[model samples]
Target chain A: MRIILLGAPGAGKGTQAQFIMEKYGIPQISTGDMLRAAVKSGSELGKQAKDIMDAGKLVTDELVIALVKERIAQEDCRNGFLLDGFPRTIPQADAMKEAGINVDYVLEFDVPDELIVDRIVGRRVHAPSGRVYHVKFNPPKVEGKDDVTGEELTTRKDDQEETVRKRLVEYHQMTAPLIGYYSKEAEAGNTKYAKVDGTKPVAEVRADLEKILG
Target chain B: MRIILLGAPGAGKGTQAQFIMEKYGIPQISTGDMLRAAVKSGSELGKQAKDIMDAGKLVTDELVIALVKERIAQEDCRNGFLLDGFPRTIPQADAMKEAGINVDYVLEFDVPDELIVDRIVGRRVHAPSGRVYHVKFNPPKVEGKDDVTGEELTTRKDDQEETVRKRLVEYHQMTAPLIGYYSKEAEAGNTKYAKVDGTKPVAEVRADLEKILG
Candidate 1:
């Protein structure tokens, strides 16, 4: 099935998307990867992305919908693709609509900013092997260290309260309208939408998503 | 006074902004320049800009407001600064408001899509000298050739109707909500905003802007 997953940066939207991808037998699309790959090509769409991004010349507000559309039309997407972190704005989703994409489902992994910040601020990462542990959720055995290597874990700058709060501002500004747009569409019976409690227990969240999709 | 200019791709906002800058004796802040500069330094804000931009990772949605704020705080903006193209969305304008920055004026140079396409399509340029001439408005001595050098004039790919039309789509999606936000604020008397007819003659448009700002 086709879907759009929405959430802030420390939300478990990505985690839920992983499960949805496996269940629906669809690949999840990352517009970032598609955009980077599009940069190498000489197509009009490729050139458009490069104009804003590659030259690093100016802050040209560009739309990456072309690349997403191009990527979605691949042979693998004969069924559909699960989209996440792609359409950060309603305009992005509007661009998809203009491209004739029928977005069947939009799931917002809802979680309060405080919980997200609380979850992320105490988060630490093992850079080398890329393992992660949260001081509150899943603390490492020895504290401030990786479980296996015992290497010191570092807190990412993005996990800082101020940074996360800034990110939340951007996220809300970009997505709140989009959430409204899709909710309206769902009311009109053109699409499906679910606001899943992202802060819930893993199984409860999973059950909510499954029942909604089912 | 400090302000932001809003308009579409070919809306002549740049021309009016230049006039505003000269009349007010305030530098116009090009977000592109501010963002590029912020990339070099490692100050808290600078590092934040560099993180998404210079990291060469994904398509980071970098907002220049932080850099704009940083730049506006510098000695140059003591009197005021004219801003163009920074607040591309409503959220961006909201961010500026939240930062305790008061925009003295927001000029939206409104031009219809057809006129913009008409204005840009017949535009030709001399690459070496960077001389620009419009066929209908400011035609050169001879057709298809530069007035002085006898060099063949070239139409920028961006000046093509198709490209400019595509650009308008992105511009509207970015700015329409911002236009709404500013209009609401203007009604409340918190800020001043004007919708000037950019499709009018240059003198007429200038007169309109003069009357509005005065």
Candidate 2:
């Protein structure tokens, strides 16, 4: 059951992904995390990729592809693997197809832009205590202040309205094409493309995912 | 006179790039434009890429590189060709180097994020008349109404605060590594990396670029 999850940053894919991985007993392969792990492993490709990354340059796609192939060859992936952030670009996705790394399902967590923007930008943080509050969803006791310390709540750069909006634009541009590719693939009966409503309650969403996966 | 320009979307690189192209007598090879042109030309690589793009998929890096090489081989490029956005990813840039496509200069138009956000988001358009006004920098005579038609102005989806902010994020992520690569190249005396003050007036910025090229 090799699966690919597609969504915007705060589309709750992480929560559902964890649930799927635990229930299905498949390892999650997040490219960012996997890249770091590869570097830490000190393998030959890792060493070369590390040198490029260490010099503040991006590791070549060839190296990244090699690493992914190596990772999927591990014993744990004998059952299947969950891809979180691999195949980010069309070429990468094309390479996967050419390499015969077939995906069973492409699940897209479809959440509207306005809802995602609201969900993310409303967040306020109490950095001193590592507490998070949402301006709209989860208001503080004193409003604009932390519950325990009563300190003024601050915003994270990532959670800024503009930042979130910008991210959405990029997400649409990069992932929309992939979605089209997968949709065509589904039409050709090669794989399945499941669109899950991401704005639903966690339990409902999880139930929907289970129904689709089963 | 081979050059690669690095800048955010609204960082005034377009104007300066035009100036450089005219003065230096080199063609501006914008990837987006070039890709479309290639599709129209119906070259062997173009035919393949056009099919991919028509299917709403990104063309592979190899195809894009082949197109670039084919473009540079033309007689007009005997002097040089100014690359605007071909080698966007580190792998693409690495391909350029590995393929022996030497670059003499990497000119970066350095504009602050806040400045770019302000410059882009403030724009208001008179669609029928094709007139533009900036909220802060070039406000309309009667506030939100257009000066020419006295009609209410509209904000373009591209100029929305969130859209511009997101583009900036993408620009930094994609180009920062390229900047690092060029800086290291500069250090090794292989090429010059010049950061021009993009915030300056057009003529002054052009002068700075001219001085560097000389």
Per-candidate interface DockQ score: 0.03, 0.01
Give one digit per residue, the lDDT tens place, for model 2 in A1-214: 8998887777767778788888788999865545556666766666555544433345566777888888898899887989975676778788888888889999998889999888898899887666899988899999999999879989876688997898789878988888889999889998899999988899999999889998
Instruction: List interface RMSDs for the candidates, in order.
Output: 9.5, 17.7
What is the Å distance of residue B97 in model 2 from its true position? 32
Provide the lowest-lDDT 10-residue window in model 2 chain B: B49-58
Kindly report which residue pairs in candidate 1 clash with one another: none
**lDDT of model 1, residue A91:** 68
The local lDDT score (0 to 100) that residue A61 gets in candidate 2 is 69
Instruction: State the lDDT of candidate 1 residue by residue for A163-196, as single tens digits.
Output: 8899788778878888899999899998999898
Q: Write candidate 2's Cα lDDT for B1-214 as tens digits.
A: 8998877767878788788888888888765555556766766666666545432345677877888888888888888989985577788888988888888998888889999888888788886665789888889989999877799998765677886787679778887888898899899998888888988999899888878898
**Taking the tens digit of each residue's C-alpha lDDT, what string does model 1 give over B1-214?**
8777777766767777678878888897765456545655555566566546432233233345567778899898988998776676676678788888898888887889998899889999887777889999899889778999999898877888888888888778767788888899999999998888887888899888778877
User: How well does model 1 score by local distance difference test?
Assistant: 0.76
Question: Each model's fnat?
Answer: 0.00, 0.00
Given the true complex, what DockQ would model 1 score? 0.03
